Every structure is written in structure tokens, then in C-alpha cells.
């Protein structure tokens, strides 16, 4: 929902952060699916914020976040 911070970065920072969340979720599931990642609460938290963050990027694409 709210950001400030996650919309407040510059377009170059914003991508480089919101990309990081979007990848991280997918890479963390990939680390488990191998056998490296072990804290699954961290993944589950990481999804909430992946979803918020990767939504922020979406919202910024159409004009919802100027």
C-alpha cells in the first residue's frame, strides 16, 4: 500500500531496488529448491513485500505513481 520511500528513490534506484525484491523471491525459492535457503518465514515475508514493491513498479508504469 503506502511507500513514500519505495516511490521516493530516483528512476535508476527504483528499478535497481524493485528489481532486487522481484528477483530475490524467485532466487530464494531457487535456493531452497536446491538446498541452500532454509528460513521459509523469510521467503513468506519476502513475498508480501515483493508483491508490494513489484506492484510499486507496475503502478509507476501506467501513471498510478506519476
From Swiss-Prot:
GO molecular function: structural constituent of ribosome
Annotated keywords: Ribonucleoprotein, Ribosomal protein
Domain of life: Bacteria
Presence of the UniProt keyword Cell membrane in the record: no
This protein's GO CC annotations: cytosolic large ribosomal subunit
InterPro entries assigned to the protein according to its UniProt record, in alphabetical order: Ribosomal_protein_uL29 (IPR050063), Ribosomal_uL29 (IPR001854), Ribosomal_uL29_CS (IPR018254), Ribosomal_uL29_sf (IPR036049)
Record Pfam families: Ribosomal_L29 (PF00831)
Gene Ontology biological process terms, A to Z: translation
Xref: HAMAP family: Ribosomal_uL29
PANTHER family noted in UniProt: 60S RIBOSOMAL PROTEIN L35/50S RIBOSOMAL PROTEIN L29 (PTHR10916), LARGE RIBOSOMAL SUBUNIT PROTEIN UL29C (PTHR10916:SF0)
Family per record: Belongs to the universal ribosomal protein uL29 family.
Name of this chain's protein: Large ribosomal subunit protein uL29
Amino acid at each position: 500500500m503506502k511507500a513514500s520511500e519505495l516511490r521516493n528513490y530516483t528512476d535508476e534506484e527504483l528499478k535497481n531496488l524493485l528489481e532486487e525484491k522481484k528477483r530475490q523471491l524467485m532466487e530464494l525459492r531457487f535456493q531452497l529448491a536446491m538446498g541452500q535457503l532454509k528460513n521459509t518465514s523469510l521467503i513468506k515475508l519476502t513475498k508480501r513485500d515483493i508483491a508490494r514493491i513489484k506492484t510499486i513498479l507496475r503502478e509507476r508504469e501506467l501513471g498510478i505513481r506519476r
